[PDB]
A paper describes a structure:
[name] ([name]-[name]-2) is decorated with spikes, and viral entry into cells is initiated when these spikes bind to the host angiotensin-converting enzyme 2 (ACE2) receptor. Cao et al. designed small, stable proteins that bind tightly to the spike and block it from binding to ACE2. We set out to design high-affinity protein minibinders to the [name]-[name]-2 spike receptor binding domain (RBD) that compete with ACE2 binding. Unlike antibodies, the miniproteins do not require expression in mammalian cells, and their small size and high stability may allow formulation for direct delivery to the nasal or respiratory system.
The best designs bind with very high affinity and prevent [name]-[name]-2 infection of mammalian Vero E6 cells. Cryo–electron microscopy shows that the structures of the two most potent inhibitors are nearly identical to the computational models. The very close agreement of the cryo-EM structures of [name] and LCB3 with the computational design models suggest that the main challenges to overcome are not in the de novo design of proteins with shape and chemical complementarity to the target surface, but in recognizing the best candidates and identifying a small number of affinity-increasing substitutions. The large amount of data collected in protein-interface design experiments such as those described here should inform the improvement of the detailed atomic models at the core of Rosetta design calculations, as well as complementary machine-learning approaches, to enable even faster in silico design of picomolar inhibitors such as [name] and LCB3.
Numbering used by the authors:
A (entry chain G): 1 to 55
B (entry chain A): 27 to 66, 82 to 110, 116 to 135, 138 to 141, 166 to 172, 186 to 211, 214 to 242, 264 to 347
C (entry chain A): 596 to 620, 641 to 644
D (entry chain C): 348 to 595
The structure:
Amino acid sequence: DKEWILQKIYEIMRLLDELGHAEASMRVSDLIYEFMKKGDERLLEEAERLLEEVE
Amino acid sequence: AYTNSFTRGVYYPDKVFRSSVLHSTQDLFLPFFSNVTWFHPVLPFNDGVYFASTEKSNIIRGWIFGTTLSLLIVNNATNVVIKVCEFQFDPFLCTFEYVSFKNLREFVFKNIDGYFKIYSKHTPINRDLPQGFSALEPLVDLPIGINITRFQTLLAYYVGYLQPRTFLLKYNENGTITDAVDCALDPLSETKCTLKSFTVEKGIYQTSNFRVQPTESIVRFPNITNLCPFGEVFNATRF
Amino acid sequence: SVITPGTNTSNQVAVLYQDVNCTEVNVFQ
Amino acid sequence: ASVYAWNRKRISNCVADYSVLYNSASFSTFKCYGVSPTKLNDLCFTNVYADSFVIRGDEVRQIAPGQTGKIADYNYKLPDDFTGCVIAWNSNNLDSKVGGNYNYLYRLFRKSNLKPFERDISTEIYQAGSTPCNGVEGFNCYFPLQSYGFQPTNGVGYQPYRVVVLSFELLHAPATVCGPKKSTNLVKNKCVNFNFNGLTGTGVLTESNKKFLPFQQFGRDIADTTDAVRDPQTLEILDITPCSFGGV
Ligand SMILES: *[C@@H]1O[C@H](CO)[C@@H](O)[C@H](O)[C@H]1NC(C)=O
Ligand SMILES: *[C@@H]1O[C@H](CO)[C@@H](O)[C@H](O)[C@H]1NC(C)=O
Ligand SMILES: *[C@@H]1O[C@H](CO)[C@@H](O)[C@H](O)[C@H]1NC(C)=O
Ligand SMILES: *[C@@H]1O[C@H](CO)[C@@H](O)[C@H](O)[C@H]1NC(C)=O
Ligand SMILES: *[C@@H]1O[C@H](CO)[C@@H](O)[C@H](O)[C@H]1NC(C)=O
Ligand SMILES: *[C@@H]1O[C@H](CO)[C@@H](O)[C@H](O)[C@H]1NC(C)=O
Ligand SMILES: *[C@@H]1O[C@H](CO)[C@@H](O)[C@H](O)[C@H]1NC(C)=O
Ligand SMILES: *[C@@H]1O[C@H](CO)[C@@H](O)[C@H](O)[C@H]1NC(C)=O
């Protein structure tokens, strides 16, 4: 399941660059760094929330 | 081939002005009347090198100094270029970089506490090293911190080696060295250095101390064939 | 000790090794 | 340079006038480590290395000994025993572009932390999952780097900062890098306490009629004491006499 979570956070930041919202992507980038070193899955919810604010 | 160095390879040991005075100093100098190799190849550097050359067409342009042959000194046209780098050069013509028979050129190359010191003299000539006396002055001092054990000359030249000998250097009124005594050359020179004069008055002078030297080394221990039981002390099961 | 005429006469010198036997070092004892 | 591929400039054989940077007032951060920032000018080093890179404002805090984070660990690592001065400044009006400046990159996905002063410039795809990538990006396979989309309208933590860490090499060596030791003025015909390039003492300095050789800096008497000095800036020779004394 963890592999899919990381993939989703990644696809989200990729889209945020495409949409012209580099700041939002940078925020998500930080979620990736932290996620990859922790068991805290709420970082996915944050990546998704940030995308919703942008879209 | 070899030549007679006569009284050459003397340089101003420091940057101190002295006049009308005889100063005794110990430094790395070419010994007087020493045996200098005559090259009409990679050579040892030892404790420092005396280098000299005679020219007709300025065929010698530079030198390589280092270990696993390093720094390169090249006199290309009018501006001498010095670089210290790893090089991939039979050579012929990076923490530091600097840019500046009829003719006799003399150089002294020594490396002390990381500083590569270059002294030199130029004079016109009209066979091998001319007999006479002059002193070489410092021109370049490279703060590199590089080990030198061997060197190579890049294209006649003479190569000698410096030794920790004591010299008596005579300074004239204008601060130049006009005469020198090699204190290890002969008993008369020893007397001159002892009296700190280039002239010795009639008499008997004590100049040194003779000591018979040991030949070989004699070592004697009793007929002990066993080994001390340290294992029973340090690797014991119980203390 | 170095035994010498003044250098204004000659640079020839003689050397005296004090309190030694010559075989240890014109040789005159 | 980018932070992932940071650039190292060697500073050597020169005068390290640190006051040029320290008092410029153009830096937001001028944090030094191991040396007071106001005492740098009195030091000599074997070498100084200037490591140049770009990060975002919220990453500036990572450029320090003992720190962790995607930059401190995956792009630019400083050692716990690191000596040097770290400087940084805001470049939002220089290094940003409309639509986003994506010309500079950092690593986000890494297997392990960097060693001090390590520079990894590899473009190999990172394997995040249990399966091999075999050179192909996709599920659980990512090119380790991510561009910094610096935009002029981003919040401060997301604005670009230029950072130039200065690393000081202080080993046994001949001095190559020394601070801006400055002169005063000259005093003549008076008793003065002097220091000429390390030559020190007290006495009265007067114009001499002595001529030194071009390479000589000072002179001495028969009783190896100094009696004349060359002026380092004028190159004239002055005699040094004792400062008057006697019994009463
Ligand atoms: C140098 O040594 C050689 C012996 O190897 C000798 O024949 C030659 O005369 C010497 N030359 C000088 C200047 O001492
Ligand atoms: C000597 O060589 C250097 C290259 O290392 C070059 O830059 C310099 O101009 C040359 N000097 C002259 C006088 O041609
Ligand atoms: C020079 O050689 C000595 C051994 O003779 C060694 O201990 C020293 O580290 C070397 N220095 C350099 C700069 O290579
Ligand atoms: C010292 O230099 C002057 C020229 O300035 C010269 O006339 C004088 O003879 C020189 N003195 C000696 C001892 O060489
Ligand atoms: C103790 O045993 C080790 C392992 O064989 C050996 O290396 C060591 O020298 C022994 N100590 C002494 C005092 O013999
Ligand atoms: C001493 O040397 C001088 C030359 O400088 C000479 O004129 C004089 O006659 C010499 N005196 C003696 C006793 O030889
Ligand atoms: C020197 O040694 C020899 C023995 O080889 C001895 O006969 C002679 O008397 C000794 N001379 C002196 C001055 O000791
Ligand atoms: C020392 O610096 C001054 C400028 O302040 C200059 O005019 C003078 O010529 C310099 N000294 C020498 C020996 O060039």
